[PDB]
Ligand binder design. Structure first.
Ligand code: NC8
Ligand code: NC9
Ligand code: Z82
Ligand code: CL
Length: 330
């Protein structure tokens, strides 16, 4: 089997991407944030505290003839930005772009934190990291991809995120028309439960390539590119007027600037992020200072290849017995 679904930026800055997902019978379509950095499929629901729902589409398990309460199962997740959500668990039929999994754990939110409430465009998350990070207790549950894997033509999914435009998530096949050149594959460590890999270096604009190992995760659920302070300083040093602002929480730059590109290495291959991809617009409405798309990971403990990087590439998440990651230009 295979599936193919369009993923769409939620706003003009590509702050996140949403992908329609069918849950239950008859289908209830929710727009989920596919997140290769986490491992729960959780949704706004009829059980979510009313005051914490503001425009989201909800899953109502009582209206699904295939929904079954998973007795005693609960979930609770907190994230690095202080956000959180929690609730109970149903099993139900879930379909993505024509690919169907029966008996998928659908984690129904009873509580969500304000940052989720405030994002009306995102109805939940679909985690695509390894199932070892799934939070359901006392019996851990599998991700949509793990559940689908055996049925897929090939045990892979691909992320093809657009810049200021829709893109595609494919399951079970590689669309050879979706990239240029070849796909370069690189080793993955699953020890921490992430798609963790090592970039071979970087360049800023037309500058010389610096060969250096940068360990990080491929994370479609993170908007920006988070890299070591040395790398980030070298990038912003090429932008007149750019500075690290403590009050704003990162590097900012004059909105009048044209940004240099940023290149990262994948083995002997190179992915080039155009400068425009690194502009995240005014720091506050009407400001002439803009927020940078490359920020320091210094306070994280890991580097994060988020959407800013991933959208410059066609990315293969290879879930074979020994997982790997592939990157192609496009
Ligand atoms: N107290 C705390 C600290 C860290 C964590 C990891 C965490 O937040 N994780 C890993 C994880 C995986 C599985 C599960 N069951 C739970 C979490 C979520 C990731 C999911 N991807 C999208 C978004 C993410 C959130 O990033 C940020 O907050 C962030 C903040 C500052 C900077 Br500089 C860069 C990014 C990354 C969670 C809580
Ligand atoms: N300082 C900071 C804050 C948050 C992060 C994570 C991150 O990237 N996001 C939050 C998040 C949290 C948890 C999950 N599981 C998925 C996404 C995405 C949001 C980033 N802010 C832009 C506006 C948004 C929506 O309008 C997108 C990174 C750095
Ligand atoms: O804020 C943090 O400490 C953090 C955020 C994301 C990830 Br992945 C790991 C750590
Ligand atoms: Cl300002």
């Amino acid at each position: 089997s295979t599936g193919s679904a369009t993923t769409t930026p939620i706003d003009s800055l590509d702050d996140a991407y949403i992908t329609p997902v069918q849950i239950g019978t008859p289908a209830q379509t929710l727009n989920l944030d596919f997140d290769t950095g986490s491992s729960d499929l959780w949704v706004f629901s009829s059980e979510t505290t009313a005051s914490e729902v503001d425009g989201q589409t909800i899953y109502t398990p009582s209206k699904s003839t295939t929904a079954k309460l998973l007795s005693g199962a609960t979930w609770s997740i907190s994230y690095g930005d202080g956000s959180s959500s929690s609730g109970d668990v149903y099993t139900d039929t879930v379909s993505v772009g024509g690919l169907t999994v029966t008996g998928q754990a659908v984690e129904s939110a009873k509580k969500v934190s304000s940052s989720f409430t405030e994002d009306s465009t995102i109805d939940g998350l679909l985690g695509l990291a390894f199932s070892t990070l799934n939070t359901v207790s006392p019996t851990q549950q599998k991700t949509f991809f793990d559940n689908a894997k055996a049925s897929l033509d090939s045990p892979v999914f691909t992320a093809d995120l657009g810049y200021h435009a829709p893109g595609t998530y494919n399951f079970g096949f590689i669309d050879t028309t979706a990239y240029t050149g070849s796909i370069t594959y690189t080793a993955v460590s699953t020890k921490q439960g992430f798609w963790e890999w090592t970039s071979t270096g970087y360049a800023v604009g037309s500058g010389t390539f610096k060969s250096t190992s940068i360990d990080g995760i491929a994370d479609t659920g993170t908007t920006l590119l988070y890299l070591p302070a040395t790398v980030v300083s070298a990038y912003w040093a090429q932008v007149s007027g750019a500075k690290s602002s403590s009050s704003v929480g990162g590097y900012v730059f004059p909105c009048s600037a044209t940004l240099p590109s940023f290149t990262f290495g994948v083995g002997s291959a190179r992915i080039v992020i155009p400068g425009d991809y690194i502009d995240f617009g005014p720091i506050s409405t009407g400001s002439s200072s803009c927020f940078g798309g490359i920020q320091s990971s210094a306070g994280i403990g890991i580097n994060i290849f988020g959407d800013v990087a991933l959208k410059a590439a066609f990315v293969v998440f290879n879930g074979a017995t020994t997982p790997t990651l592939g990157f192609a230009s496009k």
